Amino acid sequence: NLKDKILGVAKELFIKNGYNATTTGEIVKLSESSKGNLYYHFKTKENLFLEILNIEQSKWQEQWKKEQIKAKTNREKFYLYNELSLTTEYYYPLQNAIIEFYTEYYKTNSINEKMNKLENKYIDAYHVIFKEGNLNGEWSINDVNAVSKIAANAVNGIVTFTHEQNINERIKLMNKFSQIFLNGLS
C-alpha cells in the first residue's frame, strides 16, 4: 500500500524522534514516495499527524472495548483503563510528539478544527465509566465532564512523566491513583 505505508513510517518517526524532529523528506525517503502522495488526502504535515493520532486513538479505543469485559463494576473499569493505558502500544507512546505539536501550533486555529474532536475520544472512556457508574450507583458524580477531563489528564500525567522506571512500579502508582481518585468521589 502507499498511504497505509506512509502512516506506517510517519508514526514510527513521530514516536522515535519528536514531532519537529521527523521531516516529510525522511518519511518519503524510507517509503520510496514523492511529494504528490501528500496532496489530495495527505495535505499539511499537521494533517498527517492529526491523522495518526486519530488512528492510534481508535486502535486504543478499540483495544479498550475488547478488553474491558474483564472488568465487572465501573470502579474496576476505572482501574483497568488506567492500567491498560500504561501497557498499550497505542497513542500513549506519541504523547511526547503531541506535547510538541500542541505548542508548535497555537496561533493557527486550523488545529482545533478537528483537534478537540480527538480530545473527545480522549475523555469519552472516562465519561461513560463515570456516568454508567452513577446509574450503577457506584458513586455520585454531578459534574461528570470536569471529572472526565481531570481523570484523563491526570492519568496521562502518570503514564507520560514516568516512562523510564520499572513498568511494575508504574502499574503500582497508577493503581494507588485510581484508588485515591475514586475514593475522593464519595
Binding residues for its own copies, per CB under 8 A?
16-18, 20-21, 95-97, 99-100, 102-104, 106-107, 112, 115-116, 119, 143, 146-147, 149-150, 152-158, 160-164, 172-173, 176-177, 179-185
Q: Nearest approach, Cβ of 122 to ligand BER (angstroms)?
A: 4
With CB under 5 to 8 Å by kind, the binding choice for 154 among its own copies, ligand BER, none is: its own copies
Which of the choices ligand BER, its own copies, none does residue 88 contact, using the CB cut-off of 5 to 8 A by kind? ligand BER
The binding site for ligand BER (CB under 6 A) comprises 56, 59-60, 63, 85, 88-89, 92, 119, 122, 156
Full 3-state SS string of the chain: CCHHHHHHHHHHHHHHCCCCCCCHHHHHHCCCCCCCCCCCCCCCHHHHHHHHHHHHHHHHHHHHHCCHHHCCCHHHHHHHHHHHHHHCCCCCCCHHHHHHHCCCCCCCCCCCCCHHHHHHHHHHHHHHHHHHHHHCCCCCCCCHHHHHHHHHHHHHHHHHCCCCCCHHHHHHHHHHHHHHHHHCCC
Is the CB of 33 or the CB of 85 nearer to its own copies? Answer: 85
